[PDB]
Amino acid sequence: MREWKIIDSTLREGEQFEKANFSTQDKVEIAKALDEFGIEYIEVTTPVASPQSRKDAEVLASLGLKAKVVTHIQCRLDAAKVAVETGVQGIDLLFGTSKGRDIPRIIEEAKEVIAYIREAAPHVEVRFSAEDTFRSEEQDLLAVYEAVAPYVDRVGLADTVGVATPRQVYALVREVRRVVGPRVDIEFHGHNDTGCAIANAYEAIEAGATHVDTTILGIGERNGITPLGGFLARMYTLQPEYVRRKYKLEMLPELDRMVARMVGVEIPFNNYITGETAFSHKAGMHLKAIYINPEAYEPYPPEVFGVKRKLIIA
Amino acid sequence: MREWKIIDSTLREGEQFEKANFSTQDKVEIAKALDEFGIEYIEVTTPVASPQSRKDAEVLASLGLKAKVVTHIQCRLDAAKVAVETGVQGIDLLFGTSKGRDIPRIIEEAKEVIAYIREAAPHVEVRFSAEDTFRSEEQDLLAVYEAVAPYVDRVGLADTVGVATPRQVYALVREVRRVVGPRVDIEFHGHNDTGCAIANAYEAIEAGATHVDTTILGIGERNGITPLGGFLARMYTLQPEYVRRKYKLEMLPELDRMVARMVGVEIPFNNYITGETAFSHKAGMHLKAIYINPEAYEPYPPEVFGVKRKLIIA
Ligand SMILES: O=C(O)CCC(=O)C(=O)O
Ligand SMILES: O=C(O)CCC(=O)C(=O)O
Ligand SMILES: [Mg+2]
Numbered sequence A, B: 001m002r003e004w005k006i007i008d009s010t011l012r013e014g015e016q017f018e019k020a021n022f023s024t025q026d027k028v029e030i031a032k033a034l035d036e037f038g039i040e041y042i043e044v045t046t047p048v049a050s051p052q053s054r055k056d057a058e059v060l061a062s063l064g065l066k067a068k069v070v071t072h073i074q075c076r077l078d079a080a081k082v083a084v085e086t087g088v089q090g091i092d093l094l095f096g097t098s099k100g101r102d103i104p105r106i107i108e109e110a111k112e113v114i115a116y117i118r119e120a121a122p123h124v125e126v127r128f129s130a131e132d133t134f135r136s137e138e139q140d141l142l143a144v145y146e147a148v149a150p151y152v153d154r155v156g157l158a159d160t161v162g163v164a165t166p167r168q169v170y171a172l173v174r175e176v177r178r179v180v181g182p183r184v185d186i187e188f189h190g191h192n193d194t195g196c197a198i199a200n201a202y203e204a205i206e207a208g209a210t211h212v213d214t215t216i217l218g219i220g221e222r223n224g225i226t227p228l229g230g231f232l233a234r235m236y237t238l239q240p241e242y243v244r245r246k247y248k249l250e251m252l253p254e255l256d257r258m259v260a261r262m263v264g265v266e267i268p269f270n271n272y273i274t275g276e277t278a279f280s281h282k283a284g285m286h287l288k289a290i291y292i293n294p295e296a297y298e299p300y301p302p303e304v305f306g307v308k309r310k311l312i313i314a
């Protein structure tokens, strides 16, 4: 069934955006606004990055938000300790691409970090991801995921370089689901270098993924990851009842403006839903249809997301 | 095999962009620049739109470009006459969604318009599309395409409202290929309302499509269609030899600037390849990899497209 949640990573992946320079107060404002919106998880930079990243994690995790606050660390004993001490509700392990590949060792090293966390904070949710998941040799990847999955709440896949294709993502998520079973959750994180972050997230869900990483406006390393708004536009057309129940969709314009303001960008003219142009109609044969029925050339209603259409009649 | 061509529609679909107001000279400049780039087709607004659309079609078709110039008309006898008289090298018929549906009639009406064109201009390439192809009842759609295909050079599919999913596009293109046979070309046109225009174009090609519609920066009705640059980024990662042979890729920045300048927009901060941020790296563990190998977190080389990476070390 198509049930899924969003992990916002504006305060993690989004910090890796070129122009991101979030004050503790910027982060709190973003987190509170995402919580009001209904977002299920808020992921934050590793506490090990700096004394300020640690403090921010500590504060965000203690905000009393309905959303779970989770932090993203390298899969190391070092960083695990720091992470649990911050009070986060979840820890997202990333086993980085080093790595040749000795698999029961990798399995041992992962299970150890995971074991410490269960010991030291049994109520913290643990996710395990290998970096560059879609480009790793698949037998070894599945071998590691299959062995680690009984010990974790979730496994993730990361299209780190933004080159995975929708059918590749669908296929690999299906194989992961087959080896981890129905209980373990499956998270997808995808970069947008080839314009496939939204499509891939969607195919990931169709294949059984339960969690999708987004950032507001898609901010992140390079051209960033799956954007919150474009993702909701995609999901809304397919599950409109579900999506409108889950989230305060009319808040999207303000989330996009807030982050645009803070990182010093303009909202792209063609940005999903909230871009200057998202609902503009011009062709005569289009306009003549919008008068009998606004739906005729509209994928979704603009009022649902708190915006309006423009007609260009001249 | 993965052979395909691009039909640029900046001078057709792109004219339907909210802020598009192209002078005859703007169009000539765009067309010449696309021709230098290596684009195979340039599609232009219907000559029936206004006396100026007719003139522009006439001029563009007579520029002596290597690219074929083709015009997009309603599937009517009226408009066909006007179209051949302009000297275009191709005519792209669109049978609009009216339509209930009486199929041998629709087939008769289409075959007639097509027959006139063969009579009056036997060297003109004819494409047939039904509007809103992915949402039409499939048996009737395939019935019409199958009957019309022996008489045309190409059939197209249009995701008019921008809601088709990548696996739906793949499937329907496969079914169309099955009924039209290996000779007739297959064109895909997709809107970006749900962030799937690039993904869909790519899946269309994997399924056997031979032609993809793009506009520079994706300008078009609403948030527009498959953007030239994001499409090339997608294809380049998969067929780098082929793509770099076909097109002058280092011209992409200037094509994007030219159109941004003319329609009065800024290039999106995260725009594929040419956006301010397309090649910016920040995370410490990313930067430490870019020094040993720039490829480690880069989908494609920036110099290939005439741009540079940015490192954010502080
Ligand atoms: O752990 C993850 O899923 C994401 C880490 C990341 O930014 C990437 O691999 O692209
Ligand atoms: O004829 C076509 O393929 C495209 C016409 C169009 O703009 C659409 O259906 O979205
Ligand atoms: Mg990432």
Ligand SMILES: [Mg+2]
Pocket (backbone or CB within 6 Å): B013, B160, B189, B191, B220, B221, B225
């Ligand atoms: Mg269109």
